[PDB]
Amino acid sequence: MKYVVVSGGVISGIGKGVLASSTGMLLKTLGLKVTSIKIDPYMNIDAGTMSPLEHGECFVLDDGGETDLDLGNYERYLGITLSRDHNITTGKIYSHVISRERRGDYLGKTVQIVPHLTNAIQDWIQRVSKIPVDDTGLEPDVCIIELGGTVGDIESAPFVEALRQFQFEVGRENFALIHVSLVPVIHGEQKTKPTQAAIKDLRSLGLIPDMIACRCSEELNRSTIDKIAMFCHVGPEQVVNVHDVNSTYHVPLLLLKQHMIDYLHSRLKLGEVPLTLEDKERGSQLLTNWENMTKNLDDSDDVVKIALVGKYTNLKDSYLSVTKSLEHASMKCRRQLEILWVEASNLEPETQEVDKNKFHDSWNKLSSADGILVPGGFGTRGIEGMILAAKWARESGVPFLGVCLGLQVAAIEFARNVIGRPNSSSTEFLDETLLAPEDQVVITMRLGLRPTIFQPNSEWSNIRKLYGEVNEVHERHRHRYEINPKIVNDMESRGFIFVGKDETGQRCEIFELKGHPYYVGTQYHPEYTSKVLEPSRPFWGLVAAASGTLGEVIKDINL
Amino acid sequence: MKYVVVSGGVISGIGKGVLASSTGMLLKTLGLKVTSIKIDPYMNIDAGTMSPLEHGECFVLDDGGETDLDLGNYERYLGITLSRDHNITTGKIYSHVISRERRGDYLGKTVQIVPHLTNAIQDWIQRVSKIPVDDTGLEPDVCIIELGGTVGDIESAPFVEALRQFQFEVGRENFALIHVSLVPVIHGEQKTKPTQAAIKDLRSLGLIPDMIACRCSEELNRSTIDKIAMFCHVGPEQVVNVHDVNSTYHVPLLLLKQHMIDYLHSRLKLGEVPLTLEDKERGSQLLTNWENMTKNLDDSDDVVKIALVGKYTNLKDSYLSVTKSLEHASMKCRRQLEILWVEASNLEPETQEVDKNKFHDSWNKLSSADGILVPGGFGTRGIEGMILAAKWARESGVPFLGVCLGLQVAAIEFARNVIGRPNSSSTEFLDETLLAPEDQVVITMRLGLRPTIFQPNSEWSNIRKLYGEVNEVHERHRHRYEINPKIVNDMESRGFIFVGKDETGQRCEIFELKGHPYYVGTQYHPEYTSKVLEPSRPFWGLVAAASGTLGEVIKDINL
Amino acid sequence: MKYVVVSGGVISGIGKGVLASSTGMLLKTLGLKVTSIKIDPYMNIDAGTMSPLEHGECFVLDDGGETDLDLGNYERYLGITLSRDHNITTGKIYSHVISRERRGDYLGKTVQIVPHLTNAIQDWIQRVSKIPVDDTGLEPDVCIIELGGTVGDIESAPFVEALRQFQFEVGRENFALIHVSLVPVIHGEQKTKPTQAAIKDLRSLGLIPDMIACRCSEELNRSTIDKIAMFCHVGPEQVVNVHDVNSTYHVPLLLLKQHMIDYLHSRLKLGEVPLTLEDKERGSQLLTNWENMTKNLDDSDDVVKIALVGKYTNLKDSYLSVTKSLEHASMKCRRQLEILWVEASNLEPETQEVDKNKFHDSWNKLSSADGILVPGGFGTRGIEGMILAAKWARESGVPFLGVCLGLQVAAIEFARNVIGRPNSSSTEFLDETLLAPEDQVVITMRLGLRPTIFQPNSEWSNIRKLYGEVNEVHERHRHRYEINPKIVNDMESRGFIFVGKDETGQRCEIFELKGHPYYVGTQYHPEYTSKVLEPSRPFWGLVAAASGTLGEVIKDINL
Numbered sequence A, B, C: 001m002k003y004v005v006v007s008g009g010v011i012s013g014i015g016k017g018v019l020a021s022s023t024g025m026l027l028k029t030l031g032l033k034v035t036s037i038k039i040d041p042y043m044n045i046d047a048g049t050m051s052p053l054e055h056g057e058c059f060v061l062d063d064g065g066e067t068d069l070d071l072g073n074y075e076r077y078l079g080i081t082l083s084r085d086h087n088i089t090t091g092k093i094y095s096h097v098i099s100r101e102r103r104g105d106y107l108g109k110t111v112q113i114v115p116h117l118t119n120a121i122q123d124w125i126q127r128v129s130k131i132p133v134d135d136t137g138l139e140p141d142v143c144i145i146e147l148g149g150t151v152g153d154i155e156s157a158p159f160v161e162a163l164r165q166f167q168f169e170v171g172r173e174n175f176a177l178i179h180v181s182l183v184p185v186i187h188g189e190q191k192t193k194p195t196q197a198a199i200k201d202l203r204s205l206g207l208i209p210d211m212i213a214c215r216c217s218e219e220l221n222r223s224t225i226d227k228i229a230m231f232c233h234v235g236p237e238q239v240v241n242v243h244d245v246n247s248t249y250h251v252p253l254l255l256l257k258q259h260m261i262d263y264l265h266s267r268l269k270l271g272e273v274p275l276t277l278e279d280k281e282r283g284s285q286l287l288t289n290w291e292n293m294t295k296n297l298d299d300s301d302d303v304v305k306i307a308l309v310g311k312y313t314n315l316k317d318s319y320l321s322v323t324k325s326l327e328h329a330s331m332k333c334r335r336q337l338e339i340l341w342v343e344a345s346n347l348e349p350e351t352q353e354v355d356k357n358k359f360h361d362s363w364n365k366l367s368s369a370d371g372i373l374v375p376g377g378f379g380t381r382g383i384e385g386m387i388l389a390a391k392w393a394r395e396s397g398v399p400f401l402g403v404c405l406g407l408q409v410a411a412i413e414f415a416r417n418v419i420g421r422p423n424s425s426s427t428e429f430l431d432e433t434l435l436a437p438e439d440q441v442v443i444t445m446r447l448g449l450r451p452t453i454f455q456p457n458s459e460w461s462n463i464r465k466l467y468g469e470v471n472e473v474h475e476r477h478r479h480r481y482e483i484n485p486k487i488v489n490d491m492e493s494r495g496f497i498f499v500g501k502d503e504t505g506q507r508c509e510i511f512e513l514k515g516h517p518y519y520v521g522t523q524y525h526p527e528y529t530s531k532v533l534e535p536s537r538p539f540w541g542l543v544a545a546a547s548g549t550l551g552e553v554i555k556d557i558n559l
């Protein structure tokens, strides 16, 4: 086993999550079975209690574990599947050892937070890094630990102590620390004193740093690096600069130009880890897929405009997984992406009574879009705008994907505007009216990776061509409310055909509309399973249809 | 006595010197006899050893004390005269107490740096703040101490201890601390953790802060101030923001909008200091002169271009006092200033053999200028360019001021190009040739405020009109080399008339050329004596002649 | 080259000087040419200005450098000769670099205390550790640096930074840090939190510790060591305990039982240093001399009582070198030592008018003594008591040594009480009387190691037998006042024979009285040249005469 801990910061907004998700990617190019752990200093047990307004979207794992965003960034960069244990939190570990007290397992000793709770952290990291994460049950070679918060805090405090002991309870040369740090620029001069005042605290809290990964606004001066290597004890080759480049998928290749694999190969003796040619050649091939997709980003010019239609579009992190899946689908089509933020409530005609500028800008963005996405919203208060965009996408022939709530407004749209029931309703919203035309029903939660089976006649469905025509699809779910299955025999007659269903047959999970270029609902969330080299099939479908050449993508899949 | 200490910083480049020079200005509007002290953590005794390349120009005081730049900023903002004791340094105080050891004055005790050296600091600040600084020998009401370096360093260390004792050895309510601090902005969010990691160190080193003067890139958010007032113990009204505004002469009036006089009047009980109406009404009148000159800057549009002709123009701080004196002269003329940086060596014809672009850009800037300045350079290696600009200024009639070396190249120019001795030379440069046409001689140093007497016939001289026709002028000097007095009887015959001389008659200190709109040499430095409401008379002459209306300025002076 | 820095402390009184003087002794048993450096955070240039009341005696080096006590402890433990450069001080290094500024050697840069002054420290330690110190001009293999003050102070601050850079400017594995630390005991429990709050500061200031040398009141518990090895990163074998044992000459052998040579041999790779058999066998022989002299201390029982007669005897550190030389002489005679503190002014008959108890206790202690010492006092105010003890020692036949002032009161005693001039006087005291019987004269200072030549007839003198009958003696001096050489021809006739003189013949440096068992004056200081295995010959003479068997010691010397 080996560990690399990514850590530090003068400030908590500094962006450690790319250097974690990008260090682990570079180590996966050596062919190593890499894994990752997030530490979050917040008290939440797991993210399911905190709304998407409050620091971004509610992620989903194979377990159903509603979790921190930063798990998702490692899953999509590293190709790995994570579990709800990979998110260490102050909530979890304190709830764990305090529940263990009432169980009695410390034999009625004191449960001081030094010794015993820092021992539970060091045990949890050693459990979790041995859980398998790739397509086979082989245990990881290297674990990337992202230490949330900063080193020099009061929510960080048990973790930085636990990791001082863990620098020895796992031997040095099986552990390395990467310290992210701030180097401000003021009046044209690079200021390395915030960094030198977090190297003092790092040595004090007891870890010793290996890298000094500065988030400067610039290239670091040769004299700036020379002084950081005088005040921190690292050699000047190790003072990596992580400055902005044309997209975040380039960041691994900047770190590779900055020798970071050659340093980590030495500093953790990675030549002593046992690897097969099936490991190593997969490693060096994955490097060439990353060099190819970044070269394709560097000279892709032909734009594709996708309208993302929903509430809270000013909080873009409320959709981080939706955005990132369109970026994967974009780079695979070799069309450059623009996403058009349509704040759905502005499409509703009553907006014309409040501000006409909002009513025109939103319908302008929607009309300009080469493809349309209803992105699995939350709450109900924007729903009429999401219905109008689904009417537009059906009648104007524009490519369409409905995710989760998106499948459900598509059934509501089709009921109101093709089946001809204008009172038909989201039972998710208009409940205590008790009306008969209910497009949905509550069936109290359903979460995690679940099996979707294709219905028998489905051969013609573009969505089934995009899934490689395989009879079953494994994808991640969230929904309380599902389509009322007593309308399905009507929709099945009117050309709205339910391509895919749950294994009991009673629950509807995919539809495709007959006789449209690409119009799909998926009631699972296709966002979360997308990887940077394997875009999620419904999202690859959307960005292909909107680019043209949907047929040529269907060959690239099925060959 | 009262003290305000201006201090702090996450980073040393943060710009405390304006908040010091601008806090003391606001207190002078209450009519208080304000003084100021600079602390510089460097080991230099005094600045005379360190070249103008190395952190800016070599200042001069009335004593001849070659000193830190930051004395100058208080002198010109506050109208005060300082002495070489007002610059506390690590060099000075350690040289003082270690020389005092060999003298024996600690009675053969140990001279630990705690107790005894921190007692010498607390004694020095109490000596120095009682030295008089205004036009009358009245001792100061309030002293502004600017603590150089940062609070949380190893060159700062005896000063922050000395000032912890000084918070009591002078009572609280006779002392206040203003902590300047950094609040970075990253991804659009204001980051108050560098500030909260210098409030921790401040409390630790033992001073307690009063103000939290942030150097953010923005207006501070109401929520940013509320959190800084939660982690520092100041109330939110006291978290002053010191953001950029149209010129640094506005900064006092931003601090006045941010209640800083109303706070300091309370927090130091300044109503208990005895003031006359001659103090108070001078105070409130000086406020209206500052409101008037800042209002004049806000709608002055008519440009005046002054060529500053010399070496090292890329190091603008090598001329900070020259620049600032032109800004005072500008605002008094009500013309907006552009200074044209002419790197003098580019005017020399040999530059045409090296790069024609440099030869044209430099002569273009010089030809475009409404007035010309030879700014008292250092060394000799650009001198031929400074001679060509003096030839141009004489023959093309353009307004001219030569400061120090500027008077001397004007005599060399006039000798080569009007008297007709083309071999005549700077004895400052071409020494061991031993030639007879020496325009200068060494007479080993001459420094500080000295008396210049006008020669008898001088009545017609525009420079004597600008000095109010008063028979003697008191101004600050630096020169090893002076005009060879055996050429003067020739220049006096050719219309180059030496308007002013030293009290012995043997040394030449001012000239004005007959029959030119404004062409002056001054061998003293007129820069250093300029105040923000009293621009230095030769520099007011230059910016007036270049603006036109030199006659109207001569009425504004003599009425 | 190799360095071991001895450092640290929660408190400054903790006793680092034995662990320094005893680590270097253990390394000298490997045969290495060891040297040592003292750092003193005080501002004194050198100790000559600070009186023996103020933190102990005024030491003397071969240079004449009046220096810190702690040089002496290394000289006598390690056999080495030091120079006044081996005492780094805050006074010296700041006086050095600030004098270097007025000389100009930083080329007119800023002389910040970071970079430039910490570079002067790192240069000074690298100069000084290459100066030779043994009987041949071979440069040292290992240097012990004793860091005075504590790590976590403001007088320490440039040294701990300089030593962070010096951990790299000399490579790791050529440097090691030993951190002395406090482990209090309260209510019967060992408290390792003062230690854990100086390991935090050590890591912060940037050095990393190797040893954790606790000054507990007890043996450290196995659980106390296990927790210190959990919070500091050292392994539990390295947490040395330095508790009290029967004399400080045992301390090296406790550290040798605690593996400290086996650890330092590994941690500095001391097997790679080139050694001859003449080095190594001298090393292992010196170990057996230390095992022998400590075994002799463990079962020596026969007491010898030496009266030390002088002022300020309550300040025993005012005589630290005098005490330590008697301990060497004691262990060489194999008699256990008691020193009788005679506060000399109490022997004066006027004390009988003030307190009879003082008059009896002091004469009781003097009468009880097996031998008598006048220990080179300072000032004059106790002199009549020192004369009465010299009268007693001459007439009652008791063994006597006069050091410096001791030789001079012996001449004054002999003049008043054998030559018969009762008005004869110390010209050091009774000056402006201008009397003719002056026993002394001023000849303005005379310091350092000087050559003493024996006068021709001297063969019979016990002092010349103790010096091995060698014609010249090299020993360290301090005296303004010396015996008036115009009395010598009288004393030479009366049996007070001047055995030794300065090379000019004009100055008198040793006498021995004819026809007494052992009665010696030495006007040099014999204390400072004594080593733990080579006691100073006059002091070996005194403790031998007082033990009996002075003849048997004269064989042990001359064989």
Ligand SMILES: Nc1ccn([C@@H]2O[C@H](COP(=O)(O)OP(=O)(O)OP(=O)(O)O)[C@@H](O)[C@H]2O)c(=O)n1
Residues within 6 Å of the ligand: A012, A013, A014, A015, A016, A017, A018, A021, A073, A148, A149, A248, A317, A320
């Ligand atoms: N490989 C990555 C990593 C991060 N991000 C972006 O980074 C964001 C949030 O910043 P991040 O780098 O994850 O760190 P912070 O949120 O600043 O938090 P912390 O510094 O506490 O880890 C999201 O907007 C996401 O789009 C990204 O686009 N690609």
Ligand SMILES: Nc1ccn([C@@H]2O[C@H](COP(=O)(O)OP(=O)(O)OP(=O)(O)O)[C@@H](O)[C@H]2O)c(=O)n1
Residues within 6 Å of the ligand: A190, A191, A192, A193, A194, A196, B010, B011, B012, B013, B149, B150, B153, B154, B155, B156, C112, C113, C114, C115
């Ligand atoms: N740990 C440190 C670093 C620097 N200094 C001193 O503080 C002065 C001012 O600090 P600065 O020169 O700004 O050093 P930097 O570390 O570069 O600060 P910044 O990065 O903000 O420019 C330096 O000249 C130096 O003498 C200090 O006392 N302690």
Ligand SMILES: Nc1ccn([C@@H]2O[C@H](COP(=O)(O)OP(=O)(O)OP(=O)(O)O)[C@@H](O)[C@H]2O)c(=O)n1
Residues within 6 Å of the ligand: B012, B013, B014, B015, B016, B017, B018, B021, B073, B148, B149, B248, B317, B320
């Ligand atoms: N009233 C003021 C104060 C400062 N400056 C400008 O500020 C400069 C240098 O910055 P300063 O504010 O004096 O502080 P720093 O040099 O950053 O140093 P420190 O923060 O260590 O005090 C010069 O360029 C000067 O033109 C100015 O124009 N007007």
Ligand SMILES: Nc1ccn([C@@H]2O[C@H](COP(=O)(O)OP(=O)(O)OP(=O)(O)O)[C@@H](O)[C@H]2O)c(=O)n1
Residues within 6 Å of the ligand: A010, A011, A012, A013, A149, A150, A153, A154, A155, A156, B190, B191, B192, B193, B194, B196
């Ligand atoms: N002294 C502090 C301040 C904050 N926190 C914790 O650290 C987390 C991340 O710090 P941050 O939210 O960034 O707080 P700020 O002080 O604003 O940091 P910055 O100014 O850099 O944004 C906070 O949610 C809080 O729980 C802490 O442990 N100790």
Ligand SMILES: Nc1ccn([C@@H]2O[C@H](COP(=O)(O)OP(=O)(O)OP(=O)(O)O)[C@@H](O)[C@H]2O)c(=O)n1
Residues within 6 Å of the ligand: C012, C013, C014, C015, C016, C017, C018, C021, C073, C148, C149, C248, C317, C320
């Ligand atoms: N080998 C040694 C070392 C020290 N001492 C005794 O130790 C004394 C002073 O304490 P020391 O151990 O030298 O250290 P401190 O004075 O406590 O100072 P510091 O801890 O600052 O080094 C003297 O009384 C001296 O007799 C000794 O007898 N033998």
Ligand SMILES: Nc1ccn([C@@H]2O[C@H](COP(=O)(O)OP(=O)(O)OP(=O)(O)O)[C@@H](O)[C@H]2O)c(=O)n1
Residues within 6 Å of the ligand: A112, A113, A114, C190, C191, C192, C193, C194, C196
């Ligand atoms: N660095 C540390 C060490 C201990 N503790 C906590 O503080 C409690 C009380 O400290 P103590 O048990 O006394 O630990 P020691 O380090 O042994 O303190 P001392 O040596 O003074 O007994 C411990 O139970 C532990 O939970 C802590 O918070 N931080």
Ligand SMILES: [Mg+2]
Residues within 6 Å of the ligand: A012
């Ligand atoms: Mg925050």
Ligand SMILES: [Mg+2]
Residues within 6 Å of the ligand: A015, A016, A017, A070
């Ligand atoms: Mg993050």
Ligand SMILES: [Mg+2]
Residues within 6 Å of the ligand: B012
């Ligand atoms: Mg700097």
Ligand SMILES: [Mg+2]
Residues within 6 Å of the ligand: B015, B016, B017, B070
């Ligand atoms: Mg400044």
Ligand SMILES: [Mg+2]
Residues within 6 Å of the ligand: C012
């Ligand atoms: Mg003390």
Ligand SMILES: [Mg+2]
Residues within 6 Å of the ligand: C015, C016, C017, C070
């Ligand atoms: Mg000591």
